[PDB]
Scaffold this active site. Structure first.
Site, PDB file in Angstrom:
ATOM      1  N   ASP B  25       0.823  -1.224   0.000  1.00  0.00           N
ATOM      2  CA  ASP B  25       0.000   0.000   0.000  1.00  0.00           C
ATOM      3  C   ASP B  25       0.846   1.258   0.000  1.00  0.00           C
ATOM      4  O   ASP B  25       1.342   1.638   1.063  1.00  0.00           O
ATOM      5  CB  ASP B  25      -0.918  -0.019   1.235  1.00  0.00           C
ATOM      6  CG  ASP B  25      -2.054   0.983   1.031  1.00  0.00           C
ATOM      7  OD1 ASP B  25      -1.865   1.959   0.300  1.00  0.00           O
ATOM      8  OD2 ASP B  25      -3.116   0.719   1.642  1.00  0.00           O
ATOM      9  N   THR B  26       0.983   1.834  -1.199  1.00  0.00           N
ATOM     10  CA  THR B  26       1.817   3.043  -1.277  1.00  0.00           C
ATOM     11  C   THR B  26       1.140   4.207  -0.585  1.00  0.00           C
ATOM     12  O   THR B  26       1.810   5.216  -0.298  1.00  0.00           O
ATOM     13  CB  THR B  26       2.086   3.401  -2.756  1.00  0.00           C
ATOM     14  OG1 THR B  26       0.820   3.574  -3.410  1.00  0.00           O
ATOM     15  CG2 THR B  26       2.874   2.306  -3.452  1.00  0.00           C
ATOM     16  N   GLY B  27      -0.149   4.112  -0.295  1.00  0.00           N
ATOM     17  CA  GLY B  27      -0.874   5.209   0.364  1.00  0.00           C
ATOM     18  C   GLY B  27      -0.886   5.036   1.878  1.00  0.00           C
ATOM     19  O   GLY B  27      -1.608   5.718   2.619  1.00  0.00           O
TER      20      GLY B  27
END
Lengths: 11, 99, 99
Positions: B25-27
């Site tokens: 999850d880059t967020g």
């Protein structure tokens, strides 16, 4: 603090 | 590897001796795992996401193996609806977003 | 672009002629933007994430630019803490995760 955004739609 | 995003980018991880599935999850600033035991001292933390905040336990210097790649860092344990690998460990396995 | 993850992967988007900041989020199925006016009809949707669920308005066939790349797709509008670009539009701009 620290924010974490997985998301999915609905039910 | 090169993971396309037609589907959720789920991988197998090893943490605290257990196999788990988790979302890359880059967020996510942090790595957040469903309830499990981990060694060492911990402190309570509030983290926020799309629907508000949850309370978690913060453990330091935890080793995770992520789709074959070892990394060390802080792991948060709490009532997350999905295990997530966030930026604090994605950087350690050399992950990048490319387009 | 090759985007490393030492910092949040924040980019500029353009929607309705306006520039906004948004987070590229491989952990998001959908694209969710803070309250704003979009054209056409909308439909109701519930989306969930780390702190529970929120109600949003679904708008279809929205023209949007993401870090310079044009897309046309579905945008959800609602009380998200951050504008999020999810997989529905990351796949349109050809984004992959690589390690």
């Amino acid at each position: 603090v620290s924010f974490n955004x997985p998301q999915i739609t609905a039910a | 590897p090169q993971i396309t995003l037609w589907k959720r980018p789920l991988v197998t991880i090893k943490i605290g001796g257990q196999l788990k599935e988790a979302l890359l999850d880059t967020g996510a600033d942090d790595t957040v795992i469903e309830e499990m035991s981990l060694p060492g001292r911990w402190k309570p933390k509030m983290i926020g996401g799309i629907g508000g905040f949850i309370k978690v336990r913060q453990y330091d210097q935890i080793i995770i193996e992520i789709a074959g790649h070892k990394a060390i860092g802080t792991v948060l344990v709490g009532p997350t609806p999905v295990n997530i690998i966030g930026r604090n460990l994605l950087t350690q396995i050399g992950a990048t977003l490319n387009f």
